[PDB]
Structure formats: C-alpha cells, structure tokens
Amino acid sequence: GANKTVVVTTILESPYVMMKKNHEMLEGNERYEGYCVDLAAEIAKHCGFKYKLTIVGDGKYGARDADTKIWNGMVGELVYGKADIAIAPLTITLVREEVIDFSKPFMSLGISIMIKKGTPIESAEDLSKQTEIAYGTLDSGSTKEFFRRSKIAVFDKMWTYMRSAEPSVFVRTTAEGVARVRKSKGKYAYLLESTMNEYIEQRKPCDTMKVGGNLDSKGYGIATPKGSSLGNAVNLAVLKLNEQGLLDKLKNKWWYDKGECGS
Amino acid sequence: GANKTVVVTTILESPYVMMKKNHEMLEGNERYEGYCVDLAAEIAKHCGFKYKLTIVGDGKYGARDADTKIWNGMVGELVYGKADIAIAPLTITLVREEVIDFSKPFMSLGISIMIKKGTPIESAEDLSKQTEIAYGTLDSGSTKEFFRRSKIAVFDKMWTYMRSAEPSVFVRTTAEGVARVRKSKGKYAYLLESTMNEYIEQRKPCDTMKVGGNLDSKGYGIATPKGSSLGNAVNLAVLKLNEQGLLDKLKNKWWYDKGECGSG
Numbered sequence A: 001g002a003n004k005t006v007v008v009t010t011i012l013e014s015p016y017v018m019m020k021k022n023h024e025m026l027e028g029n030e031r032y033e034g035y036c037v038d039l040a041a042e043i044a045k046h047c048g049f050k051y052k053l054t055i056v057g058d059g060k061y062g063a064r065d066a067d068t069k070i071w072n073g074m075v076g077e078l079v080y081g082k083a084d085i086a087i088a089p090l091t092i093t094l095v096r097e098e099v100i101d102f103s104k105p106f107m108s109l110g111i112s113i114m115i116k117k118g119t120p121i122e123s124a125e126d127l128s129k130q131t132e133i134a135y136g137t138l139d140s141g142s143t144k145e146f147f148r149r150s151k152i153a154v155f156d157k158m159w160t161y162m163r164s165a166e167p168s169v170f171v172r173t174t175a176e177g178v179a180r181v182r183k184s185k186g187k188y189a190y191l192l193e194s195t196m197n198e199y200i201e202q203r204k205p206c207d208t209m210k211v212g213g214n215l216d217s218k219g220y221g222i223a224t225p226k227g228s229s230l231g232n233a234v235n236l237a238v239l240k241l242n243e244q245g246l247l248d249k250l251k252n253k254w255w256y257d258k259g260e261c262g263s
Numbered sequence B: 001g002a003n004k005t006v007v008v009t010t011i012l013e014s015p016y017v018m019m020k021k022n023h024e025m026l027e028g029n030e031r032y033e034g035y036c037v038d039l040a041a042e043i044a045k046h047c048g049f050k051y052k053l054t055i056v057g058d059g060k061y062g063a064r065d066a067d068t069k070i071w072n073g074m075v076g077e078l079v080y081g082k083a084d085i086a087i088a089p090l091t092i093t094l095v096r097e098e099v100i101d102f103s104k105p106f107m108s109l110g111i112s113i114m115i116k117k118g119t120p121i122e123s124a125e126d127l128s129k130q131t132e133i134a135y136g137t138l139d140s141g142s143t144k145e146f147f148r149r150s151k152i153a154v155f156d157k158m159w160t161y162m163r164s165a166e167p168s169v170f171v172r173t174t175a176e177g178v179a180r181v182r183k184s185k186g187k188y189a190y191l192l193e194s195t196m197n198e199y200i201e202q203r204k205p206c207d208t209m210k211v212g213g214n215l216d217s218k219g220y221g222i223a224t225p226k227g228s229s230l231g232n233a234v235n236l237a238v239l240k241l242n243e244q245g246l247l248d249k250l251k252n253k254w255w256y257d258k259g260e261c262g263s264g
C-alpha cells in the first residue's frame, strides 16, 4: 500500500535520545536530540522512509516475564506490533534474536563496572569477594540476564548476592544507577555497558570511573519485527554508515566533542 | 562428496586455521587446527551437521574482480555454489552482505598498523604525511576496499598513495605482508586487522608491533550462500556460543602467550 510513517520505538537515555532545550514548545521529532536521533535520520534517508520517534511507554529495554511469557519494553513494542522499528542502544542477545530481527551491530560494547572515584575495586572478582560495597544492574534487560544465566563462578556468586540483596540493588533507569553511585560515598558500584560508562565519565561532576576489563563482548542492533520487509534495507544502511565513518563521527560528537570533563 | 555433508570453505591464516605438525600423515578435517577449526566443530555440533573442511583454492578472502565482475576467494566459493558455509576471519562488509548471508559477528576487531620495531610511525596520520616508509594492504579483501572507498581525509590520502605506489604495496597473503615488514628494515609498514597484528607481536622473532588505535570497528561473521537454510541455525549458534563464554575461551586458547617475547 501507500507509504506510511514508520513508528520508531526508542528510549530516553542520554546521549542516545534526550529532550532538546526548548522541547516544551516543540512537537514531533523536533523534541529530541542525540546519537540515536541522528542515526534514525540517517537510516531513514538511506532507506527512503518517513518516521515518528516514540518513547517506549514503560521505559524499558525488554525482557520476557518468566511466568506470563509476555515481553516488555522496546522488544515488546515490536513483538506486539506497536512499533515498526527500534533505534536505541538495544543489545543483540539470543533470547531477543529468537523473537525479533536485528541488523548487524552499529556499536560494540561489553558489561563494565562503574565506581565512584577512589572506590577500592578493580574487577568483578573484587566485587564478588567483599560485602561492604553493594552493586547491581538495570532491570528488564540484557545485563541482568547475563548474571542470571552465567555458569562462571564469579558471576554466579555476584548474581546470588544481587538477587537477594536488601534494599534492592537493581535500578529502573541508567540515570538512577548513576545517582546511586554518585551519592553512595563509594559503597555502591553499578554494572552497565561500557560505552554508557564511558559517556558518564565525560559528564560533570566527573566523579565516576570505568574500572576493569569488559565482562563480555557484544553489540547493539537496529531491531524490527520478525520477518519485517524493512530489515534488509536497514541492515545495509548500518553497514554503509559504519564503512563511511559516520557511526564513529556520531560517537565522537556525543561523547567527546560535547564532553564536560576537559579535553 | 557425501550426502548431508556441509562443505566448509576456510583459509590458512594463523591461528585461525593451521596445518598440524605431521599433517602429511593425517587425513580430512584432522589435518587442521586453530580457532576456526574449533569454531567449526562447535557450530556443527549445535546445528547437527557433518562437515568437510576445505581450504579456499585461490587463497583469498574475496572481492569482486573489477574487470570480469566475478567474485574470488571464499566469497566466490559461496556465490558460485562450491561451498555451503565459510568459517574464517572473514569481515562483514556491505558489498559482501549484498551477495552472501552472514551471522552476527563472532569476533570484533579493526584495521591496524604493523611496523618493524623502532620505525618512526605512531598513527595513520603519520603514515599519510611522509613518503620514506611505504605501506600497503592485503589484496582482494575488506582492508583494501576500506581505503578505496573512504572519504576520511587521512585514509583518502593513504589510498591515493597506495593505489599508485611502485613497486606495488599490495600483498597476496598476510604472511607476505608480515615478511615484507620484517625484511624492509623499517621501510614497509603493513595495514592488517588488529587480532592478527597482536598475535604476531607476541611471537618470535619479536620484531614487529601494533601502533596507534584501530582505524575502524567491525566484525567477522560466518557466511552462507544467500538464502541458505543453514543461516538461521548458524546465527543462533554464534549467539549461544558467545553468551556461554566459549568464544572468549577460544580466543584465550589460540592467543595464549607462552612468553616467546620477554617475560610472558
């Protein structure tokens, strides 16, 4: 049929999508800026579609409820037909690949540790062998699932602690995790993906640090409902944008050119 | 060949695929060892297929010949129906994605610079601003195409130099490029992917090193002919092996540092 506006699900997560300064008097896509706003414009230009950015209603990346088997977050929006594409820092995982389609990755990353500067932790093993410093992950996504599924002793030990810790060590948004690190006087460390950790390290008051090696190696993909005809063109666009240097330019723009912690 | 046997095309490139010691008295898949040999076994077990390892006849990764329009290398063996899958350090690129299918990546890497130790080069920008030290890439693959297509000033300047350099700076195999670095007394530098550069730096004769940051960020994928029924299961197997930690285990095994250079 005739062209329809493509509904893009995404998540309010700096620097991927952020409210523009004057958003209160703006409408539609003009309300937003960021890495994924720019990426959406490039993908749409290369693929020849018009689109509307829509923030995921529940604020989540996406996980499947073990009891009901219902998917939430951006994954759920695609699975249940509420959006046509997700353009967000959404990790390619096996359980998600089984239910939605993904482009080849537009960014490479791994789980990492965020500390308040001066915290005496250098590794996941360090966290797992002490109890003074609490630690947790984001809810409803790939990082929490990594710990729940790991057979590696250090990560099983960490999961066994986190799942039963009181008060809860899990957070609903990345921003809540950052605040918990910043306000906890060294007594909370946050487990999150490396490029988000790197972003926060460039933001005032410049009081957090990424420590240790990444725990894994994976990627973000542009996601579509399984079998959607949009997937092929979107994937070719991702590969072209990578090869032309545009994805590197966008990371540099939003992470480093705009950094607040010096040169 | 035998029914139900998946023909795997791969390439001799250490430590991905190597001839075992005394391979002359071995047969079939047992002749070979390395990261991609182990990966092929893991993929085949997860997907439930028997397979035959074959070394690509022309020794190339794969590009589309500018004149004849014919794909060569492992890509060509898939395109023309000679192999059923490629399991190799084969880079996922746009031009290849248009003609073959790829899994999600099993390894992440980028183009990098190999110098003979002591060469006064620290970056791609350094190479681009001088002419005493020649530099080049492998023929018939993703690294050459990267420079040919790039509009980034430094990389465009490097391409303009490399494409007309005499004698030619392009090499037929990674081994030829490394040998040329070693024998050129600092006057040749080689552009090759990072994981290989790192493997070579930690081994005798301990005379090369990786310098500068990676020039790009990309991945190796398992390739199948476009539309092949094998692709879906192979992709899920790559993701499962990554999530189980097995790809990291394989990397750590085949890049294990026994201390050939320094302390280990």
Ligand SMILES: CCn1nnc(O)c1C[C@H](N)C(=O)O
Pocket (backbone or CB within 6 Å): A013, A061, A062, A089, A090, A091, A138, A140, A141, A142, A143, A144, A174, A191, A192, A193, A196
């Ligand atoms: C900024 C994204 N992010 N940073 N840390 C975590 O855990 C996430 C979410 C993850 N990419 C997902 O798809 O669940």
Ligand SMILES: CCn1nnc(O)c1C[C@H](N)C(=O)O
Pocket (backbone or CB within 6 Å): B013, B061, B062, B089, B090, B091, B138, B140, B141, B142, B143, B144, B174, B191, B192, B193, B196
């Ligand atoms: C070990 C592989 N490699 N190291 N440097 C280059 O250029 C290559 C080949 C490349 N992965 C291709 O698919 O063409």
Ligand SMILES: [Cl-]
Pocket (backbone or CB within 6 Å): B122, B123, B124, B125, B211, B212, B213, B214
């Ligand atoms: Cl460089």
Ligand SMILES: [Cl-]
Pocket (backbone or CB within 6 Å): B151, B152, B153, B154
């Ligand atoms: Cl430029």
Ligand SMILES: [Cl-]
Pocket (backbone or CB within 6 Å): B248, B249, B252, B253
């Ligand atoms: Cl290991």
Ligand SMILES: [Li+]
Pocket (backbone or CB within 6 Å): A096, A097, A098, A099, A100, A101, A102, A226
């Ligand atoms: Li999928």
Ligand SMILES: [Li+]
Pocket (backbone or CB within 6 Å): B001, B002, B003, B004, B005, B006, B007
């Ligand atoms: Li066969």
Ligand SMILES: [Li+]
Pocket (backbone or CB within 6 Å): B096, B097, B098, B099, B100, B101, B102, B226
């Ligand atoms: Li393809």
